[PDB]
Design a protein around this ligand. Sequence first.
Ligand SMILES: *[C@H](C)[C@H]1/C(=C/c2[nH]c(/C=C3N=C(/C=C4\NC(=O)C(CC)=C4C)C(C)=C\3CCC(=O)O)c(CCC(=O)O)c2C)NC(=O)[C@@H]1C
Ligand SMILES: *[C@H](C)[C@H]1/C(=C/c2[nH]c(/C=C3N=C(/C=C4\NC(=O)C(CC)=C4C)C(C)=C\3CCC(=O)O)c(CCC(=O)O)c2C)NC(=O)[C@@H]1C
Ligand SMILES: *[C@H](C)[C@H]1/C(=C/c2[nH]c(/C=C3N=C(/C=C4\NC(=O)C(CC)=C4C)C(C)=C\3CCC(=O)O)c(CCC(=O)O)c2C)NC(=O)[C@@H]1C
Lengths: 117, 273
Amino acid sequence: EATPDAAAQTKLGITAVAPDQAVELRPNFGEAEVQAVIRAAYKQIFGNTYILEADRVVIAESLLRNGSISVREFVRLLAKSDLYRDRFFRTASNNRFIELNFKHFLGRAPYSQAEIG
Amino acid sequence: MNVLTTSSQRGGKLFKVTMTLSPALSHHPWPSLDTYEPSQNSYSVVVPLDRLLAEMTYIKNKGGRVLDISPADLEALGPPDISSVAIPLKVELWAKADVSDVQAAIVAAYKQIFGNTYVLESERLTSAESLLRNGSISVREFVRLLAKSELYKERFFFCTSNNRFTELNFKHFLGRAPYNQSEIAAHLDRYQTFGYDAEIDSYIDSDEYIQAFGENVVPYYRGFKSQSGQTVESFNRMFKLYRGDAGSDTNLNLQGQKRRVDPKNLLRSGRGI
Ligand SMILES: *[C@H](C)[C@H]1/C(=C/c2[nH]c(/C=C3N=C(/C=C4\NC(=O)C(CC)=C4C)C(C)=C\3CCC(=O)O)c(CCC(=O)O)c2C)NC(=O)[C@@H]1C
Ligand SMILES: *[C@H](C)[C@H]1/C(=C/c2[nH]c(/C=C3N=C(/C=C4\NC(=O)C(CC)=C4C)C(C)=C\3CCC(=O)O)c(CCC(=O)O)c2C)NC(=O)[C@@H]1C
Ligand SMILES: *[C@H](C)[C@H]1/C(=C/c2[nH]c(/C=C3N=C(/C=C4\NC(=O)C(CC)=C4C)C(C)=C\3CCC(=O)O)c(CCC(=O)O)c2C)NC(=O)[C@@H]1C
């Protein structure tokens, strides 16, 4: 009984995310390069939910251009957003919130009940 | 680097932190040994006061080490205004100077020679002042006396390094900042054999001194305006050596005497030795 390599991935539809491409902001970044990190960050950090024009956070991503803040600081600004609160936390229970924060902030899920506590 | 906000949305004094980055602290998502981006050997972050303790411990627990911390409010301040030093002003001590004119020179000399640094009534030199105003001493010669004086040595030369003392000297005796690593090296060697007096003598004696404010002109700030044979970077170094009006050269302040001009910056303008 034979399986193509990457059969395990294609079942479970983890094919896209299994090995996952990293996006890095680089020095003297171009205008298109930054746009791509933003695009990525909003997809991971936010949930794969839809960010409409109104939703976007102008001030945080302006600082990301001109290197005032790093991407780690960009992520922190995104995470403390009416928008992040409105989705995620305000409707969720603390168990569902903490489990969501693991994932968006770090790809893993929570390893144990202690971590939740 | 520039900081764009003094305070966080929640009230909190931001503080710029500068570290030497380490592979652990940030690394490329690449195969092979982790490397920090070369351009960010010295990384800077602005953190609120609350996260400052945690931020710094983490940096240090990795191989990071902290280059310096500075309040964001002092940072993200205008480069000093050059208004007063763009055109120095200049003082000439005529022969047959009346009482007031001599006084003005004296004041001006103490200002330039000592930096903003204050000279108390007891510190002030009657003898040297005496000589000026019955003739006998040139403004140039008075200036030599001041740099010979202990007052000068105690502030500039006895606290800081000879490396620092040289540029400190340059600025006081010549408006210019130092150009090139060579000047710093020459002065140091002069000092080792000839001693302190000969070094002081070599700035007043130098033709650059003579060409500008040669005799009977109180020294003024030549730097901040374009001078012959001056490296372009020297102009930038003048902004480091001269911080605002009401900023001084002070042994008094914490770790008072340090180097305004980094050694590396000097190397850029010229190397050879
Ligand atoms: C339009 C023809 C019909 C329609 C669609 C519809 N979809 C939503 C909301 C979502 N749709 C998706 C779907 C996707 N995410 C993806 O990445 C992909 C492609 C890989 C799809 C197709 C998602 C995730 C959402 C949620 C968006 C969010 O997170 O905010 C709606 C809106 C429902 C809502 O209340 O948000 C609608 C209307 N529905 C119709 O009636 C049309 C027939
Ligand atoms: C080899 C010919 C010479 C040599 C190299 C050498 N390099 C290091 C350490 C580092 N080298 C770099 C270089 C880069 N990082 C980058 O990201 C890039 C490209 C974008 C370069 C070119 C960096 C940043 C480091 C320091 C941190 C790191 O390890 O990534 C060493 C070791 C220094 C140490 O003590 O760690 C060495 C030996 N040095 C030699 O001996 C050769 C002459
Ligand atoms: C008095 C209200 C408070 C105080 C003051 C204080 N200042 C110093 C030392 C200096 N302060 C200045 C001030 C200025 N320099 C300028 O040129 C101007 C505007 C043109 C000002 C106002 C300077 C130059 C110095 C440094 C030189 C020197 O100290 O001789 C001190 C002395 C510091 C020391 O430790 O010796 C003090 C005490 N401090 C207080 O206690 C009051 C709250």
